[PDB]
Symmetry: D3
Subunit: 253 residues, 6 copies
């Protein structure tokens, strides 16, 4: 291979300029299976890649693993192989009581509670999504009968203390993160996630285009856990949005 | 200035004088409020106090405020907060600007999605790590309005500075100096794909996001710091009018979309 | 000759000192207490008048609200040869012992602004010039006034940075919650919105700055000032700054 | 059962100690060097095996790349009763005198990651546990190796945070320009991407952590190494980490 | 008993002293006290050597601080526990500006906070600024003794070596955050480096105590000329004369 | 004298490569008198130095004064004179309830609540002790039948507010330090101290070796005042550990 981690060569992508980047290596196949003529490319560490076709054009699906550091490797190495646009698809937990399980969130900007973003730009620089990607995702959702929430996401390097979870080994969060959940709620932050600050900041710095959509499967403020059919239909909703957004971006280019 | 004639500390306005306005166009210069209002139906002067000159006018049968902010986040923060107390929910920033990328020309139009926070006021609304990002629908209305008038704007990041001089790494000054933290900073932003400098959007975007208000920004490029040529008054004045026409049409589609 | 102020070196007729209030409406009022007052210019928030004290020309120029517009004013006046800047304002105090009508002379500022950081790193002190501070203090004492002398908190906002809750959101985020009490406990006299930028930039550029303010409101009391109170307090503070300017001119 | 790892307390069979490599494919290789190895689970980047040393159960669980995934692994293993964590890896040195084939034991980490700040403020030291560090060192010496002991710079990125210019942009922004030289002049041995998170979280949580690594490349050096010396290096490093687990079990 | 924790002093031992002169070097306490009426040794504990003397019939303490904000912070806090409200710092210093000569006198209005201890009293944005009345007493005293001091900003460093960008050291190195820092301070019109004033000014403002600082310039690292020993002693003696006279003025005024 | 502050020359050290560094100038002599052929070297400001012999090798004992700034002078100037190893000895208070008066603490790392450490390395760099020094100190303690606590110390530039003391002139601590004691307790910090952050950071930056041991003479969390005999015996206990530690380091050379 021509890159350090992914196990890929330029030739293997067959001219792909756009990538869909889920977190879980097992999701790559499922997404590529909504595309035309999909084929396995490689699996190396947490990076499982597939190639598929939308609008008769090649598209990579590559898993990123959890967190900015693995995302930064994935994105950098795909960019070396000619990928210029990156669409993040995920499933998330909301922190606003008006956002329900089954809702779809499109993120315009990220609160940078990560470390990797600071290696591409100083903290004062905005972790903001690409306009054309964000539009394609929003337009894709409304066209498919979904009214997404569009706004800001908190992007944390941790699943536990950074998302102010106390159901843990220590049961503690140190003072800088005590009350942080309420802080973000009061600043109209929709949800937590763990990748978008790195993705958006590095893409803006490198001149690459990024966007993100997620399906809500849990609400931190709400009592009752939903059944794992509404979980799966939520995941489907999100994929339908990202696939259609990818087609719009391709047709537009 | 009589506090009895105002429901807010600085603007000299009451809610009723706005006649239900939910949207404001906010230029920097007090002298520009009237001109922008005259693009609307039945324009009327509202008040003038300090750097805050306000007019009302109508678009699509709805009242729209035009209020000047003065230069800088501190004065912008007062203007926005006090209009928000009087029921204004959407703020469209209009201005002219210099660019820092060689491919951006005088006469081009910039729509800003996010701001580098080189200001102070934004930190009074949210911690530094929170993004100074524009409202999606405002940004889309500004872009769409521009395209519908024959203009393809550049869309991207602006550096929002509390100063005109050292914070924009200008050396053509009294001291001729910029201290180390801001030396090389222009090049830094160029290399990070920042389009331009401006002095208000970090505060505007950060505060609106934090308060649940909607903000966007459009600007006409009237100078480029990487370029040698001097631009002429005609193209400059034309660029100002162009950008105003964009902001007005954006307001129109925001109004009709909310109907 | 300068980007914003609409002024030329010639129009200043040799002025080396400026009085810099916030409100453009006050430029003329202050100019009228000097000799041979005349209008110079008005552009955006910057309205400038010229006057004479001890047969020397003195500029009065309004700054607008906040560090950013102050930094433009001071920089551009300095390009035109002004070396000394006297800030006059009205202010709200945060200490109970400070009364409406009192006069404050500020030695240094808490840097809760952005613009100062463009002139020097945060650890550098936003401190007033010795001679300006003394002239302001002396002027006050010579007019029968015992001013408070000390530290001012200089905020880029009027609302959350001064921990106001009487607002559209009614909220202040955690980093500024408890901040007013913090400053009270650190013996800060008052809030204002310009002096951190002024002091820091003047120290950095080798210019001379001082600030005097009249207290029109106390954040620890329930009373709100009427315009007559504002007017008399303003007049009190203007008298101080005019005299301080005479003293600096005479001594120079 | 825990949220990410696909594990229950019962599946660990009382294991109090874990060896934690980064690469999912490496968990089996390492478990093969213990007694009665068995696959446990594979979920996302977390592939876990169980094995026995001095007749005692030991988990081997991959972490993926970076503090974020490490923090999930360690947290969830701690919920299941694991109290000690030994990191094994392969690394690139930044000092001219460190050779390919050398072994590094890390006492402390430069915190160039984000996850560590979710456990403790930046001024708090990312320091290895005293016991673990000694076992790693002793294990190495007993096998004829004098490891370098010292400080590692722990980066959230592979590229700009380690000041690499061989990239898509070819750029590193000013705050990281000259940072490699800065760390060299401060006697930092190497870059790595997980230890700041690991050391800081374990100190905050009351858990025990250590780290050993085999050097397979040197950023300052002309040459390029063959896979012979590389494969023996990582084999050497695994041997040190296994023996260290024994020693800790023994005491 | 009634003794403070570090200084070995009780409130009775001060005999009502409200004002202190605070040199850095233990061995200077006696010398400064001998410039006052009826000097007497009080105590010596660690770096803190204290004497009492009288000026204008009022008792005045002289206590050494040791080097750096941490020991200064002990000294000042514990003297305040004993009723001292006013603190006059006296020393000798190098200068970093070419136009400041050996033998000049510096009165410090403000400090660049390159220390740690100041941050334990106030956040970094809070100004390390001297008390108005102390600063005036020092300036007016100097002018009355035919000196015209420079009045300005001093950089207050927690180190003698790297924080003052010194390369003549064991390592020969200064890490990047401090490379170019001397020139940065020169370009921002800073007069000199010293190691205590940020802590002193910040803590005194925070606690409501009054502080001022005067120093005599005995070296200038930007100049080639080397001063002779007479000029140095004359400068030391001059700085001491100013601080004593300033204390007299403050005592008389109150 | 060929150093600026200590009043020392390389010849006066007679080849010493190692130093014991207490804080109090009055302690230097009695520590040196546990060694063979003790001799006074110099006294300047807070820096009182003595020389002694352990295992036939010369060892300096030099007092540092209080705080990172004076420590930084002492260590720099001794390094200029050829000293490469620095062992810190003192007595301390503990902030953990289970740490008793009489216990011994060996510090692996320091919380950097000081200023001088930042003049040697940026804040993210760890204030970590030298491995061999720490091992020597641990081993010496065990050999005296002491199980020392081994761990993290908080190193403060102040005695009062930075250790969250309210028994003061003002009786006040500003918000950034309110609740800080509790914060450090919950992060398993053992004790406060005033010099280790500077010492460990500078030594790692300069390539010098440092360690620290201390005897606990007071506990913030405990009710009891301990008697003088318990306190004086704790001092002796800790000094015995540091001397033995130095024997081991010398012997290993």
């Amino acid at each position: 291979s021509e890159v350090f981690h992914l196990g890929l060569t330029k030739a293997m992508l067959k001219g792909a300029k756009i990538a869909v980047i889920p977190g879980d290596p097992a999701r790559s196949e499922r997404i590529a299976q909504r595309m035309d003529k999909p084929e396995f490319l490689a699996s190396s560490r947490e990076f499982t890649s597939w190639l598929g076709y939308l609008e008769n054009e090649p598209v990579v699906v590559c898993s990123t693993g959890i967190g900015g550091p693995s995302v930064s490797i994935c994105v950098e190495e795909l960019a070396q192989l000619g990928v210029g646009t990156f669409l993040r698809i995920g499933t998330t937990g909301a922190i606003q009581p008006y956002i329900n399980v089954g809702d779809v969130l499109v993120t315009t900007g990220a609160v940078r509670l990560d470390g990797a973003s600071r290696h591409f730009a100083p903290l004062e620089y905005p972790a903001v999504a690409d306009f054309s990607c964000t539009n394609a995702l929003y337009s894709a959702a409304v066209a498919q009968g979904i009214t997404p929430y569009v706004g800001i996401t908190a992007s944390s390097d941790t699943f536990y203390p950074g998302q102010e979870r106390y159901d843990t080994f220590s049961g503690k969060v140190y003072p800088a993160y005590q009350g942080s959940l309420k802080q973000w709620q009061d600043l109209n932050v929709m949800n937590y996630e763990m990748e978008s600050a790195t993705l958006f900041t590095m893409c803006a710095a490198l001149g690459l285009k990024a966007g993100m959509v997620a399906g809500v499967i849990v609400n931190r403020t709400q009592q009752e856990i939903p059944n794992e059919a509404t979980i799966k239909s939520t995941e489907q909703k999100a994929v339908a949005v990202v696939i259609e957004a990818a087609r719009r971006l391709i047709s537009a280019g």
